[PDB]
Amino acid sequence: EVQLVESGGGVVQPGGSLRLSCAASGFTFSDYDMSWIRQAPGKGLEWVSGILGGSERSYYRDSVKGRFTISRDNSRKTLYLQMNSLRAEDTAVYYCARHGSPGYTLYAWDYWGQGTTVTVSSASTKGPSVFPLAPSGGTAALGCLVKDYFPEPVTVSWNSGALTSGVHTFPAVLQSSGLYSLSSVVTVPSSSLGTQTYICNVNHKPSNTKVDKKAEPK
Amino acid sequence: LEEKKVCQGTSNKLTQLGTFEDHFLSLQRMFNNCEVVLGNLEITYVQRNYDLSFLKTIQEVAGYVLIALNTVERIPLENLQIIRGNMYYENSYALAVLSNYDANKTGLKELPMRNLQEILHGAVRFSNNPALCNVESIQWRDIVSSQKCDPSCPNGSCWGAGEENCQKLTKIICAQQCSGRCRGKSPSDCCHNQCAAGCTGPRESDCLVCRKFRDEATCKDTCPPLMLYNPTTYQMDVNPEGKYSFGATCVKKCPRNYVVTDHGSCVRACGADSYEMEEDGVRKCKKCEGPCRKVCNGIGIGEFKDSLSINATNIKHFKNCTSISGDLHILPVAFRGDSFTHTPPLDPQELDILKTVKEITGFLLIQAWPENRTDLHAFENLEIIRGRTKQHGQFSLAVVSLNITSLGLRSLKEISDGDVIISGNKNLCYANTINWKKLFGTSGQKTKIISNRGENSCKATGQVCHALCSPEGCWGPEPRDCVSCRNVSRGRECVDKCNLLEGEPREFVENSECIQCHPECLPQAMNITCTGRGPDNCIQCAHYIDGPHCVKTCPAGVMGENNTLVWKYADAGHVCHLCHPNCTYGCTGPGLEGCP
């Protein structure tokens, strides 16, 4: 089968640099033109750059031109996007996509990679603080606030997977500090508050932070 | 029967370009006082309340008559006598009046062609003219070959209101004896056979118009020919009374700046399959041998200065090119397409457009080619690569990394400058059989031929030059691929023998080429059939013999000396002999007893 497997994404400061890779398999790579397309947090898709199968010509969106370089190594079936002078507005998921219709007679893209994430901020790595969200219908609600961490992601479970029903772990928001915060909440029996123990297990791999917090009534 | 004012006519069909006013003024200017239209009469897009009275002077159209998309009430072609239909509209029509109405169904009411009596060739069509009156009453049989109207009109037939617009009949009322047209129903009333529309009497000088040609005040089937048959010599001499044809007229001299067809007619320009040359003292049209010369700009020149390669977008622009000024570069991107500019992949078969190319003045650099083609067939007619390019590297011929098994450059005779590189073609044989140095015109030119299929692997596979090749090698395995022949060739093919004593068509040998005997030479049994080209070089004539000539039939009516015709009969040995001088319509034997 055709596959496009991306890597290279990561976190970087403004003015820093990253190189994305897109490894192809299951077809003759050098017969196909290729493009990079990105998707920021709150936007649709935006075409960024393109290159011909034999690199005879390259094409760049204006806002990117001179900071990004597209290239390919057909012997390793690989496509690249060298990104330098990175701005805040470059933060996005980047996809590679294959021009399946040769010479764009029919359509622009058939196969896409799974995406790789690029985050550009002046923030530094930091584990989260984990505070209780305390209960008091007749259903009660509790949770944990996972505050002030960088960068994404964080995972949250409850009693190590024992409690799943009624769990909502919200998408993180980006605070004006440039740090992330989310909450994980659970609806639960009011009757159970005295009798039942509820523990949120928080995990944040990039800071090796593992926290368990017990949430008790107020 | 006089000279008349001639005009050119048009060939624009239904094209409109300007305002109705500008268009009308063009017409007015064109046909002003025009009596004879050498081309077509295209009356289109004329609007109501426009005055077309000048059209009354028109008596002959040589081509077709097109009357369409007019809303003017009247088209007064009252004196149009004949449409010769030497050109057709819509592949079959000499006369076509179509869609002369607007959305209100208002338009052409009056087309009083009361003198239209003859349409020589072509068909007639009247379509969508809901306002046209009376023309439906016409009896077209009198014209074309195979209000109410006045009670005086014959069989209710009329072009318009008046008595003066009653259809005049000159064919279908004529006696059974008449050949052609008449003045009345009696055999006395018959017109000369050369008369076109009608006659003023029985003679060739009496015709209203001529069916074929007008020589002075006489109608004739042909013009006085430029050449003559000389009975003493059985050959053709120049005719001092000869005339060329200019339209339907015989003339001693063409107008200027006209040229002469092979048909001996005066034309403004030679046709598309022809070229012009003056020989001898006369500007003549001759048909091109092969595709007519056509120079085109190459890649990296003019419109193609910023074009990477021959590709889908530019290929059709090389159609019919015979010489390329500059380079031809063919690159992988051609076949891949370019998605970002919507340039489709090049269809491999379109490359055969380049078969007309005999010369490239610059470089031929081939870095890709469709994998399913086994040779460079598109360039099989390429004869010369001049290699004159001064700013694009050292190679005038590059053939790199293709899948071909042979070059197939069958016509290539010179690479005048530049180096040759033939490299990385893993299936390619035959390339080392060529003495490349013999193709070079510039001291030190070099070849770089490597990493093709090994010479020994080619030999072992039988991929060698044909047995009928000379030692000069080849462009592939066929007898058409040899650089030169062992001995004889038929066309571009080296062959083991010419058809001297056997086979058909029979042949003789001329500078090691098999040349066909003339068709009138009778094939001889295990003996040669001819000694040379033409019907005077036969051993034996297949049909008749006219002096030294093997001929299909004896001369019968051809123009001779002293303003006479030549008639001959054939004797029991198939020999042609002169008829007696007073058998002016031919004979079956010698003397007066030959023409009862």
Place this chain on the structure above:
Amino acid sequence: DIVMTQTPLSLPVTPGEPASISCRSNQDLTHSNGNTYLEWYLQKPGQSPRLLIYKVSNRFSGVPDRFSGSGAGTDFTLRISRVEAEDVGVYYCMQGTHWPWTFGQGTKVDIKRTVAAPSVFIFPPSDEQLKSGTASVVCLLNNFYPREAKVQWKVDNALNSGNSQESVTEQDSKDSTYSLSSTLTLSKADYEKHKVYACEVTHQGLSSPVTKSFNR
């Protein structure tokens, strides 16, 4: 750049029923070669985008005839004759005719269901957090439909602005509900200036606004 306008941007659909998305460009999309490179792409949750329709009305391989496209020039429409639950995601129109190629903003298609009122909860800042000089007070709306809800913070009956952030879950795969958090963030010093912290929710499943509050 050519701007591609999709309407609506949000499209709840009842499975088995039809749905339609409009795409309008600010420039004619007919290429000089005669083709109109107007495409629709679908991005399903957790997946990459994939071509659905090309050249206005042609279905890509594998795409069922429930999907069709039409239009010309600057005005186009994607139609789903009967929506299936597997069709949820974000649909994008895309223009490949003029440089640079552009996409619309994306229309999120999700599941239409019955109105359901949120269960509402307010959470005071922990003492533990207060120790660090910051107060976060959280309002939760749990399992509601539709997604639209008005959450207002009032502090001793003054309406607050600029000091809260919202987060919303993706549609629940089982009950098709949403849940929402609104987090009001204050310095400890500002926190300790006031007594009554209230979260007031306006939602279609509630006859009148619900106000949850506390004192401290």
